[PDB]
């Protein structure tokens, strides 16, 4: 119940989980608290302890700004920090199973949240059923979000861009120094990430960096090609300048911003982070990742293109419906409470709330490709029409155009299509399989039937995990026991994907063909 780690101690826990037991190290430092003058640089290394660390709860969550648009409703809520809020956040969990095991697999989880949220502490990041379920280890870690995490003068060490990225790498290392101590295996490790956790895992595989900390890669929803997962060196400095303005800090000096920027409390700069952009959308990262140089060495889309990138497996999925949880984050006619029928007009502002940046031909591009119906008097044809605008664009057909480039360099990828609707899931039916909502499957949360999932998410559920293992501990994400159906390599001719759901599992092929033409091939000029 206590491990003796690098920089000293540390004591665990035991959990009871389905008549077994999980030990769970919760809240382990990873890295010097990034407080004063260490705000906004790289994280420092960990210093010696000799006392036994108390691991035996969450730690601290980063500052960030916390979702309001629905107060006291749980899908909204359950994605807000369950812990308290601070600068000093680089802690990390572990989940081992008990008995503790020799040469585990290790899973290494990275949430998301737009670059501006999130936290490892969720009840859906939970490792403790998958330690239990499958023998391997579980770890995840807190990372700096929004401009505390990312914010950018490129090349000036005070401020370099890529901080939250650094903590994550800081992490990947930090189970590669002790991760054999708990009992897992440094040579197999697969980072795990959903949404902007995914996206950073796919700027892993591009980080010479990292390409020692791990051995696989799993995308879910995201990957760094997403219009909202690179800011450009552009957009970084005028952010950073505006940052600057709104905060009093505006100095010729560079790093003297940053030294102004410092003395500001932590309150303030999260105030006027949404504010650094004229427009924003439901989908603005103000601060993300950044070419910096240094964990980035070049614009990303070149190194997918040119094939520069760790050559291993990945494991690729999005959602059916990843688009229709931001319609109610500003599109109007929307609401979660009623059913969201909206007209031409509607959809027609909806498209300028989402591209306001965007020429009106864009805009009408957008709604030609989208508005020739099938049926032409089905009242919900403009409703869904722009959340799988939002959903194509933002998730699925960046998710399909990296697997393929990824593919096309002779490494085995594996897409899936995850389409079940949760049975508890707090949100309308109308927004269907929504982004974030594969996360508790993947995790095993339906393991456990406590907890008012059908028999058939249990066993959507159980099967989920099993591959998410078996491609972690083998690179082959097949459920080999209850003949299933196999789960075919995606290349970049046929790809061929999975699809994932209680009824039926099927193979299918070129996922939304003609809409990613679209948005992957002509949108990108306008
Ligand atoms: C780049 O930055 C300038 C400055 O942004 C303004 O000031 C910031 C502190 C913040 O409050 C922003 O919301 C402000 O708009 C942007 O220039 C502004 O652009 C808007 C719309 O184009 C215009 O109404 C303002 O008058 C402009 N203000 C100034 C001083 O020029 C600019 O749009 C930003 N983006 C780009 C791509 O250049
Ligand atoms: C669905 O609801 C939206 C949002 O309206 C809010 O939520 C409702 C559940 C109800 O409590 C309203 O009083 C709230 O204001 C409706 O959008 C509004 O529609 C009216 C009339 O069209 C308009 O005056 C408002 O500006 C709209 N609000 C927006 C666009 O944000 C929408 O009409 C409802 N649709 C259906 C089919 O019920
Ligand atoms: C207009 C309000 C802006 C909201 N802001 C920019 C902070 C984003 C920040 C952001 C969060 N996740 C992202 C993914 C891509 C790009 C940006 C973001 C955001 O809270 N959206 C909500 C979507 C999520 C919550 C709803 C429940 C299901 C999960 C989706
Ligand atoms: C660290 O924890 C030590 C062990 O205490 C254990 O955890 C607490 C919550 C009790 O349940 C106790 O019975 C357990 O054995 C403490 O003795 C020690 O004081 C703690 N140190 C710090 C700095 O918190
Ligand atoms: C764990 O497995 C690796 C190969 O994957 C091996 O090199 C290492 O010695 C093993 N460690 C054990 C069994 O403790
Ligand atoms: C001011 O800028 C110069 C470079 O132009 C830099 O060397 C110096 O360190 C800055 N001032 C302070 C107090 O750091
Ligand atoms: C396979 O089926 C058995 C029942 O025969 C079930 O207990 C087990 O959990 C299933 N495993 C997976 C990975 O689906």
Same mark, same amino acid.
């Given at each position: 119940?206590? %491990?003796?780690?690098?920089?000293?101690?540390?004591?665990?826990?035991?959990?009871?989980?389905?008549?077994?037991?999980?030990?769970?190290?919760?809240?382990?430092?990873?890295?010097?608290?990034?407080?004063?003058?260490?705000?906004?640089?790289?994280?420092?290394?960990?210093?010696?302890?000799?006392?036994?660390?108390?691991?035996?709860?969450?730690?601290?969550?980063?500052?960030?700004?916390?979702?309001?648009?629905?107060?006291?409703?749980?899908?909204?809520?359950?994605?807000?920090?369950?812990?308290?809020?601070?600068?000093?956040?680089?802690?990390?969990?572990?989940?081992?199973?008990?008995?503790?095991?020799?040469?585990?697999?290790?899973?290494?989880?990275?949430?998301?949240?737009?670059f501006?949220?999130?936290?490892?502490?969720?009840?859906?990041?939970?490792?403790?059923?998958?330690?239990?379920?499958?023998?391997?280890?579980?770890?995840?870690?807190?990372?700096?979000?929004?401009?505390?995490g990312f914010?950018a003068?490129?090349?000036?060490?005070?401020?370099?861009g890529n901080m939250g990225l650094?903590?994550q790498?800081?992490?990947?290392?930090?189970?590669?120094?002790?991760?054999?101590?708990?009992?897992?295996? *440094?040579?197999?490790?697969?980072?795990?990430?959903?949404?902007a956790?995914?996206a950073s895992?796919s700027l892993?595989?591009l980080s010479?960096?990292?390409?020692?900390?791990?051995?696989?890669?799993?995308?879910?929803?995201?990957?760094f090609?997403?219009?909202w997962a690179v800011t450009s060196?552009?957009?970084a400095?005028?952010?950073?300048?505006?940052?600057?303005?709104?905060?009093?800090?505006?100095?010729?000096?560079?790093?003297?911003?940053?030294?102004?920027?410092?003395?500001?409390?932590?309150?303030?700069?999260?105030?006027?982070?949404?504010?650094?952009?004229?427009?924003?959308?439901?989908?603005?990262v103000?601060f993300g990742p950044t070419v910096d140089?240094?964990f980035l060495?070049?614009?990303p889309?070149?190194?997918?293109?040119?094939?520069?990138?760790?050559?291993?497996? %990945?494991?690729?999925?999005?959602?059916?419906?990843?688009?229709?949880?931001?319609?109610?984050?500003?599109?109007?006619?929307?609401?979660?409470?009623?059913?969201? %029928?909206?007209?031409?007009?509607?959809?027609?502002?909806?498209?300028?709330?989402?591209? *306001?940046?965007?020429?009106?031909?864009?805009?009408?591009?957008?709604?030609?490709?989208?508005?020739?119906?099938?049926?032409?008097?089905?009242?919900?044809?403009?409703?869904?029409?722009?959340?799988?605008?939002?959903?194509?664009?933002?998730?699925?057909?960046?998710?399909?155009?990296?697997?393929?480039?990824?593919?096309?360099?002779?490494?085995?990828?594996?897409?899936?299509?995850?389409?079940?609707?949760?049975?508890?899931?707090? +949100?309308?039916? +109308?927004?269907?399989?929504?982004?974030?909502?594969?996360?508790?499957?993947?995790?095993?949360?339906?393991?456990?039937?406590?907890?008012?999932?059908?028999?058939?998410?249990?066993?959507?559920?159980?099967?989920?995990?099993?591959? +998410?293992?078996?491609?972690?501990?083998?690179?082959?994400?097949?459920?080999?026991?209850?003949?299933?159906?196999?789960?075919?390599?995606?290349?970049?001719?046929?790809?061929?994907?999975?699809?994932?759901?209680?009824?039926?599992?099927?193979?299918?092929?070129?996922?939304?063909?003609?809409?990613?033409?679209? +948005?992957?091939?002509?949108?990108?000029?306008?």
């Amino acid at each position: 119940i206590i %491990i003796a780690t690098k920089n000293g101690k540390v004591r665990g826990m035991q959990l009871t989980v389905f008549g077994g037991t999980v030990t769970a190290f919760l809240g382990i430092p990873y890295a010097q608290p990034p407080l004063g003058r260490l705000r906004f640089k790289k994280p420092q290394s960990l210093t010696k302890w000799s006392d036994i660390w108390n691991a035996t709860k969450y730690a601290n969550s980063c500052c960030q700004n916390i979702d309001q648009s629905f107060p006291g409703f749980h899908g909204s809520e359950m994605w807000n920090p369950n812990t308290d809020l601070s600068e000093d956040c680089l802690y990390l969990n572990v989940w081992i199973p008990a008995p503790k095991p020799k040469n585990a697999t290790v899973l290494i989880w990275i949430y998301g949240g737009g670059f501006q949220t999130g936290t490892s502490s969720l009840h859906v990041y939970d490792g403790k059923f998958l330690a239990r379920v499958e023998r391997v280890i579980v770890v995840s870690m807190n990372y700096r979000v929004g401009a505390l995490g990312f914010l950018a003068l490129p090349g000036n060490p005070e401020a370099p861009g890529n901080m939250g990225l650094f903590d994550q790498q800081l992490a990947l290392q930090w189970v590669q120094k002790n991760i054999a101590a708990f009992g897992g295996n *440094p040579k197999s490790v697969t980072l795990f990430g959903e949404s902007a956790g995914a996206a950073s895992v796919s700027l892993h595989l591009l980080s010479p960096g990292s390409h020692s900390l791990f051995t696989r890669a799993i995308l879910q929803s995201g990957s760094f090609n997403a219009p909202w997962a690179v800011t450009s060196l552009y957009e970084a400095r005028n952010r950073t300048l505006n940052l600057a303005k709104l905060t009093g800090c505006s100095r010729e000096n560079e790093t003297e911003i940053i030294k102004c920027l410092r003395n500001k409390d932590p309150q303030e700069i999260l105030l006027n982070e949404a504010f650094v952009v004229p427009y924003g959308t439901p989908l603005s990262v103000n601060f993300g990742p950044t070419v910096d140089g240094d964990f980035l060495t070049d614009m990303p889309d070149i190194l997918l293109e040119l094939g520069q990138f760790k050559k291993t497996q %990945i494991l690729v999925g999005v959602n059916k419906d990843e688009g229709t949880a931001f319609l109610v984050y500003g599109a109007p006619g929307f609401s979660k409470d009623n059913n969201s %029928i909206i007209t031409r007009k509607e959809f027609q502002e909806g498209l300028k709330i989402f591209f *306001p940046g965007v020429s009106e031909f864009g805009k009408e591009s957008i709604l030609f490709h989208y508005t020739d119906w099938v049926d032409d008097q089905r009242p919900e044809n403009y409703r869904e029409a722009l959340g799988d605008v939002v959903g194509d664009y933002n998730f699925i057909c960046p998710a399909l155009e990296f697997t393929k480039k990824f593919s096309e360099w002779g490494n085995n990828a594996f897409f899936y299509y995850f389409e079940h609707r949760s049975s508890k899931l707090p +949100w309308p039916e +109308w927004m269907g399989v929504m982004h974030g909502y594969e996360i508790e499957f993947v995790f095993g949360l339906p393991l456990e039937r406590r907890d008012q999932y059908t028999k058939a998410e249990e066993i959507l559920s159980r099967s989920i995990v099993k591959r +998410w293992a078996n491609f972690a501990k083998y690179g082959n994400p097949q459920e080999t026991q209850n003949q299933s159906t196999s789960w075919p390599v995606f290349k970049s001719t046929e790809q061929k994907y999975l699809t994932l759901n209680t009824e039926s599992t099927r193979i299918m092929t070129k996922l939304r063909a003609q809409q990613c033409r679209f +948005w992957t091939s002509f949108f990108p000029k306008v």
